[PDB]
Symmetry: D2
Subunit: 121 residues, 4 copies
C-alpha cells in the first residue's frame, strides 16, 4: 500500500500513477505510450490490503476505460497481477484490452498482453 | 442499461452501478472458488459508446478479501455490454493469485464469463 | 471420441483425427477473419486422461497460410474435450499476427470457442 | 525456418528443440523446468512459411500435451507468438495451459502466461 502508492512506468513507456487506500482501493491515472490514447485516463481497481507475508506478491488489478476529455477509443483495459515489494518494486501484470465491436466482430474484440511496471522512487 | 443485478453461467451475482461519467461500482458474489458473501468491485466503462451498433467496453476488478475470507487473489473482467431485449455482458477474465516470484508462472487463471440479468 | 468433424459458435469447421498416442492432425476452416478454405492444423491431446470424470486436455495450432491466402498469423486453441451424449471441446485461443517489435503489444487476440459435432 | 529450427531456452530455464519444415510444420521436443513435468515431451505446431519481409515477426504456435513415457499431468499448453530473426533471435509468446478438470472445476482449468525464448547458437 505505501508500497503500491506512487508513480510507475512500463516497458512501453506508459505512466501509471496510483494511490492505494487502506480499504483496498486503487485510484489514479494512466497515460499510454501507444494505441488510441492521449493524455491521462482515470483508473480504478482493487488490491489485497492484508496480503500474505510469506514471500508472496500482493494481488491487485485495475481498469482503464479509454475515454477522457480529449479522446475516446471505445475500449477498456484491465490489468491483473501482483505487486512485488522491496527496494526494487515491481508490478507484474497480464492485461485484456476489449474494444467495443458489433456482434459479428466480437470474436476479434480482445487483445491480451503483459506489462511490467517499475516504481520510480 | 449496465446498472443492475447480473448473473453469470456459474451463478455468481454481480451487482453494479454505472456512473454517468464512466465509473463502475458494486459488489460481486462468486458461486465458486475461495470466496463467500459479497466483495467490493470497482471498474470503468465507456460512457459514450459508438452509435454504430457496437457494444460498450468495460472492465472491473475484485480483490478477494472481505470480512469473511482472504484468498490473496484478484480478478479482472474485461468485456463489453451488449444491450437490447436480452442484455448481456460478455467478458474474459484474469485471476491472479499472490505467489512467490518463482511460482509466478502459475499465478494467473484465464476464463470467460457471460452475464445476463436473468436470475438462475 | 475426439476424432470427427466439429463446429464452433462462429460456424467454423474443425476436422480432426486423434492418433492413439496423442497426435491431433486435421484441417480448420474459419467462418470469420482473413481466411478462406481449409488450413492445416496439428496439435496434441492427453491420450490417457484421468478416469475421475475429468475432461481430456488438448491443444492445436493453425498458421493462416494456404494456397489461397496468407494472413501472416497463427492461432492456438487450448482446451479440453468433454465426452458424453453431447460431446464438446471447450477452448480458449490466442491469435498472434506477425508484427514489428513495436506493435507487438497489439499482436495477440484472445477468445474462446466451443465446439460440438452438430452441423449448423 | 532455418531461422526457427534449433534449440531455444526460456526465462524459466525450459528447453525447446524444434525443426521448422518447408511446409509450415513445427516438430520437436519440450522440456519444462517447472510444473508437473519431467524429461522431454513431443511438440507439434505450425508457422507462417512465407512471412512478410517488411520488419514483421513470423507468426507461429505449438502445443505440448504433458504426457510422455514417464509422466502424465493431464494437461496441455499452447504457445502462440512470433519469431523475430537476425543475430539475436527470439521467439516471443503467450501461452495457455489447460488442465483436464471435472465440469464443476472447468472455470479454473486454464493458466495464462508468457514466455520469451532465446536461440542458442
Ligand atoms: O488503443 C486503445 O484502444 C487504447 C489504448 C490501449 C493501450 C494499451 S493498454 C495495454 C498496453 N499497455 C500500455 O501501457 N498500453 C497498451
Ligand atoms: O478462488 C479465488 O481466488 C477467489 C474466487 C475466484 C472466483 C472466480 S473469478 C472468475 C470466475 N467467475 C466467477 O464468477 N467466479 C470465478
Ligand atoms: O484473421 C486471421 O488472422 C486468420 C483467421 C482467424 C480466425 C479466428 S481463429 C479464432 C477464432 N475462431 C474461429 O473459428 N475463427 C476465429
Ligand atoms: O504442470 C503441468 O501441467 C505441466 C507442465 C507445465 C509447464 C508450463 S507450460 C508454460 C510454462 N512455460 C514453461 O516452460 N513451463 C511452464
Amino acid at each position: 500500500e505505501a508500497g503500491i502508492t506512487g508513480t510507475w512506468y512500463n516497458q512501453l513507456g506508459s505512466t501509471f500513477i496510483v494511490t492505494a487506500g487502506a480499504d483496498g482501493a486503487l485510484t489514479g491515472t494512466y497515460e499510454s505510450a501507444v494505441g488510441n490514447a492521449e493524455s491521462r485516463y482515470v483508473l480504478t481497481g482493487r488490491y489485497d490490503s492484508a496480503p500474505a507475508t510469506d514471500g508472496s506478491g500482493t494481488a491487485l488489478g485495475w481498469t482503464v476505460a479509454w475515454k477522457n476529455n480529449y479522446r475516446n477509443a471505445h475500449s477498456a483495459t484491465t490489468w491483473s497481477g501482483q505487486y512485488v515489494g522491496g527496494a526494487e518494486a515491481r508490478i507484474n501484470t497480464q492485461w485484456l484490452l476489449t474494444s467495443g465491436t458489433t456482434e459479428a466482430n466480437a470474436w476479434k474484440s480482445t487483445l491480451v498482453g503483459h506489462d511490467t511496471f517499475t516504481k520510480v522512487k
